[PDB]
């Protein structure tokens, strides 16, 4: 009985493969060949942030594009005034094993998580003056790889139990758990319209969810190893992943397949962080060989390199206004590039 | 010229001072990654040592020991084992009453790229009742290729040698020890290994070693 429908499942997989093959009448490489190259982009470290003491693992920008978030092994979640290199807050963590952080789009709340299996949400704009913890979201059975705010009252967390979930911060319950990943989810990014998101697990597959229906809409499986980072294209109709095989791949939602692969023969180290630019022409990827690369997302050429970190870069993200990109590394240093 | 909001800079400097004080306070603590098989005596060894992820902390001879039982994560080890880099030692413990799962885990954690230069404190826990097992079920049952005397001492030595044979880097040490669940001495062994590691790190920082 199991094989009777396993054959049907294999037939369905072959059918979707044939459909995607038929839909690929061309490729991005031979369509964007007439576009002039973006050239060589040289970025200089405008500001460096030297507050942390051990292994910054995560980072998130504010919506105002001036305030950062920084989560390190030191057990501190210090948010920076990036313009003046000031520390406007210093949140001590209950557990120093932090793997992710997020800044709410309104700027009121900052989240955190890690090996403690709990997404603890910290209220910044408190009447008491200090930064208390508002809610401790529990229910996951794996390390929290990533977490992002839909708004002040909804957060979606990607955990290490091969599931992602959508939480109600006011009540603290799992409003809608997402399942379908065979391996543990390691990354997560939300669409600009916020109606849907994607997640990349260690099964070398990135799936398209939707926060309202709760089902899985499409699956992209072009990689070969564990996926460590995902980011949408700015228009929300494509996204770029990053895995341990040192290749970043750009999948497009409409054609449901893979458009381009950003791989070079001189790099054999996996990507830890990926983010686009404001226009979407660039593609900033943070590699394990201590340095970041910027990729011409429409031509796959290495536009430039962002070196200056003495250890593996673990986080990377451009601001909403696209003015600068921040890279955090295991050297406990943050740098702002322009 | 800063405005009257240079109090923001003052607050930033106060935050930096608090961060530096907290960092120098935390550096004085010793971090141990406790590791092993399921029901291998980790709970027993922590309970005898005076007290998701669970951290056990105790003080012995003016050292603050922090033991992290990372056995509570039933996920892919490689995706979070890089968190426990830069620990002083790995207090790996096995159950002699068992086994090849322990050998596989030891091989995985001894040659890991992050833990190449990290010392391992190996505990052959529960060696009091291993005599009962070896008196009725010889080590040939657990190790088919083992040939030789079936005495308690020789069997324990063979198991210890098998565990130490999974070590390849000559720059790391494996302080093997036997617990027999009586304990009251594992703290001393961990303290001596941590003292060796601390002295080696101090020599490394000064360029001597």
């Amino acid at each position: 009985e199991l094989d009777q429908l396993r054959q049907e499942a294999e037939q369905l997989k072959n059918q979707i493969r044939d459909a995607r093959k038929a839909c690929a009448d061309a490729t991005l490489s031979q369509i964007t060949n007439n576009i002039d190259p973006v050239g060589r982009i040289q970025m200089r470290t405008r500001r460096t942030l030297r507050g942390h003491l051990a292994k910054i693992y995560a980072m998130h920008w504010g919506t105002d594009s001036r305030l950062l978030v920084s989560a390190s092994q030191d057990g501190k979640l210090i948010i920076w005034d990036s313009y003046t290199t000031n520390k406007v807050h210093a949140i001590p963590l209950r557990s120093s094993w932090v793997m992710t952080c997020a800044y709410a789009p309104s700027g009121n709340y900052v989240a955190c998580g890690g090996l403690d299996n709990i997404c603890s949400i910290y209220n910044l704009k408190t009447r008491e003056g200090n930064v208390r913890v508002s809610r401790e979201l529990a229910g996951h059975t794996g390390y929290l790889s990533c977490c992002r705010f839909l708004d002040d009252n909804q957060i979606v967390t990607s955990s290490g139990d091969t599931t992602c979930a959508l939480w109600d911060i006011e009540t603290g319950q799992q409003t809608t758990t997402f399942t379908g990943h065979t391996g543990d989810v390691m990354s997560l990014s939300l669409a600009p319209d916020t109606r849907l998101f994607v997640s990349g697990a260690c099964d070398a597959s990135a799936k398209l969810w939707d926060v309202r229906e709760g089902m899985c809409r499409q699956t992209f499986t072009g990689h070969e190893s564990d996926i460590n980072a995902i980011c949408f294209f700015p228009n929300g109709n494509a996204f770029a992943t990053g895995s341990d095989d040192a290749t970043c791949r750009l999948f497009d939602l409409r054609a449901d397949q893979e458009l381009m692969t950003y791989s070079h023969d001189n790099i054999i180290c996996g990507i830890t962080s990926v983010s686009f630019s404001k226009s979407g022409r660039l593609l900033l990827a943070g590699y394990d060989d201590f340095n970041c690369n910027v990729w011409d997302a429409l031509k796959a050429d290495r536009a430039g390199v962002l070196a200056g970190h003495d250890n593996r870069v673990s986080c990377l993200g451009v601001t909403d206004d696209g003015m600068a990109v921040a890279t955090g590394s295991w050297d406990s240093f943050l740098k702002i590039w322009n | 010229l800063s405005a009257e909001e240079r109090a923001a800079l003052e607050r930033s400097k106060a935050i930096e001072k608090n961060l530096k004080e907290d960092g120098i306070s935390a550096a004085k603590d010793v971090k141990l990654l406790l590791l092993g098989a399921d029901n291998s005596g980790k709970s027993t060894i922590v309970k005898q040592m005076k007290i998701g992820i669970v951290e056990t902390h105790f003080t012995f001879k003016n050292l603050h020991f922090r033991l992290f039982d990372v056995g509570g994560q039933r996920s892919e080890r490689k995706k979070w084992i890089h968190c426990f880099e830069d620990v002083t030692a790995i207090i790996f413990c096995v159950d002699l009453s068992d086994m090849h799962e322990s050998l596989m885990l030891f091989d995985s954690i001894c040659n890991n790229k992050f833990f190449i230069d990290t010392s391992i404190i190996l505990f052959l826990n529960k060696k009091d009742l291993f005599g009962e097992k070896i008196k009725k079920s010889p080590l040939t049952i657990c190790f088919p290729e083992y040939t030789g005397p079936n005495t308690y001492e020789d069997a324990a030595a063979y198991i210890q040698a098998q565990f130490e044979s999974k070590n390849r880097s000559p720059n790391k040490e494996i302080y093997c020890h036997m617990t027999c669940a009586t304990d009251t001495n594992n703290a001393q062994v961990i303290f001596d290994a941590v003292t060796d590691i601390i002295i080696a790190n101090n020599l490394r920082g000064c360029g001597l070693y």
Partner: single-chain antibody
Amino acid sequence: DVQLVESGGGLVQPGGSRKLSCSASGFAFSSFGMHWVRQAPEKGLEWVAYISSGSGTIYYADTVKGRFTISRDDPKNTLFLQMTSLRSEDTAMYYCVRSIYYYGSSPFDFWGQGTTLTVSSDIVMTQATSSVPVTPGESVSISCRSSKSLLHSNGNTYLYWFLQRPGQSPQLLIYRMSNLASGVPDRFSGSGSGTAFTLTISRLEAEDVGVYYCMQHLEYTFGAGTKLEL
């Protein structure tokens, strides 16, 4: 909740000395930089002293420098203003005013109840209208100018609007000329350009009756105040 209570008021012969205590409870008193302002029985607010978080920086007004001193005890959560050589110009009510300074913060958010202490190159701001009659349901505008432009080089203009209802402590309404204080109704709105500033209230309510004070925070001053009468 947040609550600052002051003690130390009373009758003093001129030239003596007295200390005013500000017992603060309900908030992280250590990280806040508490101020101290005073208001004469028939006049407006007048800043007196200021001690930061950790007592690392302290400032005084010209008319009070030397005679007074400000001290904070974080473990006991009290603020002290030791006053020496009191004169008849110090007859006022002293308010213990909260303030926390960081990017996006709202200084002067909370104000103490006050203690009536009675005894037997500076930016000056002017509010032209001493008092303007108003009616409920209408829209009224209150404007004050400054001698020196309050717009710093970082794009922030440092103007704070305070409202003092009859017999009540002043409340922060607008900080930095455009940002509403937490809890203030959205009726109030701020505007201005460098030197000339204006505050507009849409659909005035009967509870908004009071004197409005605008203060500059560019450097180490209030205005006369425009009393609104229904």
